[PDB]
């Protein structure tokens, strides 16, 4: 079967910059002069979307930055200006033999300028501590770069085991990304300290960020 | 409105079996053909067959003839795929799309919400969720942020929304993290000052496997 190749697999792009994603088809999918590619973007938590058919066919409604080209086995995906909403990834897809296929996708990422987090913490809900257990939790809110690490200090001392952080996609308006990192210890643990402290290390400063309460 | 609807989720044993579904409407259903793909996450997306609802001819990737069977249901206008002998490997969302044909060329313009299978001997467990309410401040700011923890839960996914989704603005839902057979996720808004301590600000989580829900109201500490 022909095979397609997207590359790179991840790009970065300045705001208002043009973005040149590529596909490469093992065969040819060009037919009576109709290039059988499809283009399709991709949302975090959503299905596909159609952007392009028969390699430069712009579906209805979708923006004219978006353009595409191509015959033979060399494909290009073309975004001229970058827009923040553009944060998503794209595939190509092959509709010339069967079986269909598509390439392995390419995230695409928006550059834009540094932007310090928003520290938020808190402690456990007392419904929660009826079951025993316990969670601290900081939310470090609109940043970017995305480049970042929590650590988190109990009475002075770091502690690294129960420790669940996770990073959201690029956000969609404003291109800056999100993280929350869940402390979890138990009831008995919790109680005998009083000092809950997390600290962040971002860029945008020398010193770690702190934020923190006591029980 | 064109639809093509699909339930949120099915939790099945290893060696099993599932007949997903997905419901067409705002359209003549025999008049297009209907495919369905497969996702994993970081592999990307994968073609399964086709089917003509007006006649039932179906159409297989040969990578999945014999895992897959398709059929319709025109009085309906409902579409199913079975999958066979589940195994790990089998663990994805599956989408079912519309086919269009533009001078031969075939590409998908209308995609259903998706369906997370996932395949495991494990239990369902609903999630417990917490209210996370900040409870301190100096006057430093003139915006909160309230948080919902959704812990302990199998299988993926949950939904998470702020007042029944009238608050969209300033809210942040991070993946899910797997940690001993079960996930844990939380979400986060950021409403005014004054908005918050007067104004009811609920959590709502659904999770689709347990056909569970829950309300959280966010009470100051």
């Known amino acids: 079967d022909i095979v397609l190749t997207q590359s790179p697999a991840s790009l970065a792009v300045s705001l208002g910059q043009r973005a040149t994603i590529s596909c490469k088809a093992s065969?040819?999918?060009?037919?009576?002069?109709?290039?059988?590619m499809n283009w399709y973007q991709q949302k975090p938590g959503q299905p596909p979307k159609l952007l392009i058919y028969?390699?430069?066919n712009l579906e209805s409604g979708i923006p004219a930055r978006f353009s595409g080209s191509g015959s033979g086995t060399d494909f290009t995906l073309n975004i001229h200006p970058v827009e923040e909403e553009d944060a998503a990834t794209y595939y190509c897809?092959?509709?010339?033999?069967?079986?269909?296929?598509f390439g392995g996708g390419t995230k695409l990422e928006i550059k834009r300028a540094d932007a310090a987090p928003t520290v938020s913490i808190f402690p456990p809900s007392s419904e929660q501590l009826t079951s025993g257990g316990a969670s601290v939790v900081c939310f470090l809110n609109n940043f970017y770069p995305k480049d970042i690490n929590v650590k988190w200090k109990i009475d002075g001392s770091e502690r690294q085991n129960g420790v669940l952080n996770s990073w959201t996609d690029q956000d969609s308006k404003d291109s800056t990304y999100s993280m929350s990192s869940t402390l979890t210890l138990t009831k008995d643990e919790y109680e005998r300290h009083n000092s809950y402290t997390c600290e962040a290390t971002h860029k945008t400063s020398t010193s770690p960020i702190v934020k923190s309460f006591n029980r | 409105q064109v639809q093509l609807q699909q339930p949120g989720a099915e939790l099945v044993k290893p060696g099993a079996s599932v007949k997903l579904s997905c419901k067409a409407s705002?359209?003549?259903?025999?008049?297009?053909?209907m495919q369905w793909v497969k996702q994993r996450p970081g592999q990307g997306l994968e073609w399964i067959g086709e089917?003509?609802?007006?006649?039932?001819?179906?159409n297989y990737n040969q990578k999945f003839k014999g895992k897959a069977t398709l059929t319709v249901d025109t009085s309906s206008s409902t579409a199913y795929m079975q999958l066979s002998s589940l195994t790990s490997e089998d663990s994805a969302v599956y989408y079912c799309?519309?086919?269009?044909?533009?001078?031969?060329?075939?590409?998908?313009?209308?995609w259903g919400t998706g369906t997370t299978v996932t395949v495991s001997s494990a239990k369902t467990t609903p999630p417990s969720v917490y209210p996370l309410a900040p409870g301190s401040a100096a006057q430093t700011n003139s915006m909160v942020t309230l948080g919902c923890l959704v812990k302990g839960y199998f299988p993926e996914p949950v939904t998470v929304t702020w007042n029944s989704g009238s608050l969209s603005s300033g809210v942040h839902t991070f993946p899910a993290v797997l940690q001993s057979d079960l996930y844990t996720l939380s979400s986060s808004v950021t409403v005014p000052s004054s908005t918050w301590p007067s104004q009811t600000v609920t959590c709502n989580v659904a999770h689709p496997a347990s056909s569970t829900k829950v309300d959280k109201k966010i009470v100051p500490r």
């Open positions: 705002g359209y003549t259903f025999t008049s297009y053909w």
């Open positions: 089917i003509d609802p007006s006649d039932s001819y179906t």
């Open positions: 897809q092959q509709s010339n033999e069967d079986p269909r296929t």
């Open positions: 799309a519309r086919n269009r044909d533009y001078s031969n060329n075939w590409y998908f313009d209308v």
């Open positions: 065969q040819s999918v060009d037919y009576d002069g109709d290039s059988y």
């Open positions: 028969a390699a430069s």
